Amino acid sequence: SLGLDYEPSHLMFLVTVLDDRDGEVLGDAIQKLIEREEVLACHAVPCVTKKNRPGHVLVVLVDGGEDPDRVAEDVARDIMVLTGSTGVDRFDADGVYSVPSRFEDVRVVYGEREWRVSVKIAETEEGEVVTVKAEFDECREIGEETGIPPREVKAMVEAAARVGGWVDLKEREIKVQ
Amino acid sequence: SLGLDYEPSHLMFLVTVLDDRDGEVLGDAIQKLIEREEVLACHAVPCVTKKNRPGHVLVVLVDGGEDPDRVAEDVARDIMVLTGSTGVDRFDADGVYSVPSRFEDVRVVYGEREWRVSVKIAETEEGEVVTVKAEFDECREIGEETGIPPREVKAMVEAAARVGGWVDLKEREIKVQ
Amino acid sequence: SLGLDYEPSHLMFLVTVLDDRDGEVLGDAIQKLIEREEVLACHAVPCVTKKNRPGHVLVVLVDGGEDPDRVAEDVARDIMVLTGSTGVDRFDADGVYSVPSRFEDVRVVYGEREWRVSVKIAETEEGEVVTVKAEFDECREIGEETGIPPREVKAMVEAAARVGGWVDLKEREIKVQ
């Protein structure tokens, strides 16, 4: 139990098939659907329906959280109201794999310009650091203004997150205390 | 129980992975697959298979209806016969959200030209009309020949479905009796 | 029971939602993911995430085989290590439809050039040969060098697999013994 966690999951797929007859309905419905916390993702999967008619299966990824069923019903109705569907199907995950994680803002200086990079550190009970991941968009965007390559920012930042230090890119240093 | 219905579902995903080695097999198989009532949708999802080979996961959305298993088996064999697969996997929905609905043909006149528009009215036990949806393709296609915008056809038709009347677009009227 | 087999399935979908923030992570992760036997397919499904941000739901199709849970966990960790995700969800098939199958190499000669074509023969207990499928890529690629159409190679090869013979395309013959 002190490797990967494997627990019951509150993730579900909410699924409905729409005729492509109602044109700007799906983009609009998705934009309202994502406004709520528990909707993780939306995708309209293109499909062939019954009289060789093009459809989309609207697929909504939902984190139920503490109470799934209130959340599932709220989203199901949203789907119904927003799309005109009267049949929304629900698919539950049989379990979720997880590792405890935390975030760590790492201070980056280049002599005269500075940033703060988010670093997710995923660590098990046993002390296995499975991932230390500096947020890449910040790393590459620093990698521009500095010039020096994005992945060396990443490597330095992640090593700084390990010892709780900060990065001086100008002298190639990680400073602890 | 007199809001949304949440009942056991006879919807299933029939899933098989195909090598892209057999070229015009998938379009043809889908065209035969959709010929039966209970196949709701088909999509070949592009995927990366095992020796960096491109595949498709053929995904068939099936309404089992009264007896799922006879329907599921018939479709599974069709998939097998049509594609050469010998392994078809089945994924059942854990439940379906639903609202009772009915259809209502609304008579539309523009002085000298007329149509009939299908309007789905979805209404719960409590009397909450969650959706009144005029079929959009008809609404926009009327919206052409008339000139006047498709969504005002929609709004007028849906209001006519509410009181069981008919639409006179020429004088901007909904007539009840 | 001597038609289609319908047995418990060791197939699962491993699902994780990624921000598109980490750029060349998905192609690389998929290329490592497919290296193991039990990963059947990988696809990153494009999706709309929470602050109208584009995401992908990485979807990994996994044959658990004899022990699913060791295989599932190994893949889940791979997903976690390779992508930085700390939440991998698991969806089990409710059953698999199957027909016993075997392969049969069919010798093809055109007077002076020869090949061996793989033919899958799927046959039930009752003796229903549901599919006899010559591997199409070989059939069409023979169909080139020979000139004569790919589907007549297929038909001849499949008929040869039936009687355990071999194909002489030059004299239009299937020879048994």
d(CA C34, CA C63): 12
d(CA B163, CA B177): 10
Q: How close, in Å, is residue A175 to chain C by CA atoms?
A: 25
CA B152 → CA A170, B140, B157, B176, C44, distances in Å? 64, 10, 8, 18, 40
CA A88 from centre of chain: 24
Tell which CATH architecture fits domain B1-99.
2-Layer Sandwich (3.30)
Q: How close, in Å, is residue B171 to chain A by CA atoms?
A: 27
Residues on chain A touching C95 (C-beta within 8 angstroms)? none
Please judge whether B41 and A86 are an interchain contact, meaning their C-beta atoms are less than 8 angstroms apart: no
Give the other-Cβ count within 10 Å of A174's Cβ: 17
Q: Which residues contact C35 (CB under 8 A, 6 or more apart)?
A: none
d(CA B169, CA B157): 10
Q: Are A20 and A55 in contact (CB under 8 A)?
A: yes
Please judge whether C130 and B81 are an interchain contact, meaning their C-beta atoms are less than 8 angstroms apart: yes
Name the pairing type of β-strands B129-134 and B113-123. Answer: antiparallel
CA neighbor of B130 nearest in space, from B154, B104, B102, B105? B102
Please judge whether A22 and B136 are an interchain contact, meaning their C-beta atoms are less than 8 angstroms apart: yes
DSSP letters for B87-122: EEEEEE-SEEEE--EEEEEEEEEETTEEEEEEEEEE
Q: Are C113 and C132 in contact (CB under 8 A)?
A: no
Which of B9, B130, B137 is facing A80, going by the closest CB pair? B130
Long-range contacts of B34-38 (CB under 8 A, 24+ apart): B34/A48, B34/A49, B34/A50, B34/A51, B34/A52, B36/B74, B36/B75, B36/B78, B38/B62, B38/B63, B38/B64, B38/B65, B38/B71, B38/B75
Q: How close, in Å, is residue C92 to chain A by CA atoms?
A: 7
* Residue type at position A35: E
Please judge whether C96 and B89 are an interchain contact, meaning their C-beta atoms are less than 8 angstroms apart: yes
> What's the number of CA atoms in the CB half-sphere (13 Å) around residue B85?
29
Cross-strand bridge partners of residue C77 = none
Number of Cβ pairs closer than 8 Å across B and C? Answer: 92
Q: How close, in Å, is residue A104 to chain B by CA atoms?
A: 35
Q: At what angle do helices C25-33 and C68-83 cross, to 10 degrees?
A: 150
Name the pairing type of β-strands B95-98 and A95-98. Answer: unpaired
> What's the number of CA atoms in the CB half-sphere (13 Å) around residue B108?
28
d(CA B14, CA C15): 18
Cross-strand bridge partners of residue A41 = A61
Supply B19's token pair.
């090598």
Which of B12, B21, B69 is facing C137, going by the closest CB pair? B21
Q: How close, in Å, is residue C110 to chain B by CA atoms?
A: 23
Q: Which residues contact B94 (CB under 8 A, 6 or more apart)?
A: A12, A90, A91, A92, B9
Residues on chain B touching C98 (C-beta within 8 angstroms)? 86-88
Over the Cα atoms of chain C, what is R_g? 22
Q: Which residues contact A149 (CB under 8 A, 6 or more apart)?
A: A143
Supply A82's token pair.
């927003």
Please judge whether B84 and C140 are an interchain contact, meaning their C-beta atoms are less than 8 angstroms apart: no
Q: How close, in Å, is residue C76 to chain A by CA atoms?
A: 7
CA C147 → CA A160, B77, C119, C135, C136, distances in Å? 65, 34, 21, 18, 15
CA A103 from centre of chain: 14
Please judge whether A21 and B136 are an interchain contact, meaning their C-beta atoms are less than 8 angstroms apart: yes
Q: Are A42 and A14 in contact (CB under 8 A)?
A: no
Q: CATH number of the domain at B100-177, please?
A: 3.10.20.300
Side by side, the strands of the sheet bearing B166-168 are B129-134, B113-123, B101-110, B166-168, B173-175
Please judge whether B41 and A57 are an interchain contact, meaning their C-beta atoms are less than 8 angstroms apart: yes
Method of structure determination: X-ray
Please judge whether B135 and A87 are an interchain contact, meaning their C-beta atoms are less than 8 angstroms apart: no
Residues on chain B touching C100 (C-beta within 8 angstroms)? 86
Q: Which of C89, C97, C123 to mutate to test the interface with B (most CBs of B within 10 A)?
A: C97
Residue in B with minimal Cα distance to C33:
B50
Residue labelled with tokens 């159409």:
C149
* Domain-wise residue ranges, chain C: 1-99, 100-177
d(CA C63, CA C85): 21
Residues on chain A touching B40 (C-beta within 8 angstroms)? 17, 49-50
Supply B55's token pair.
């595949």
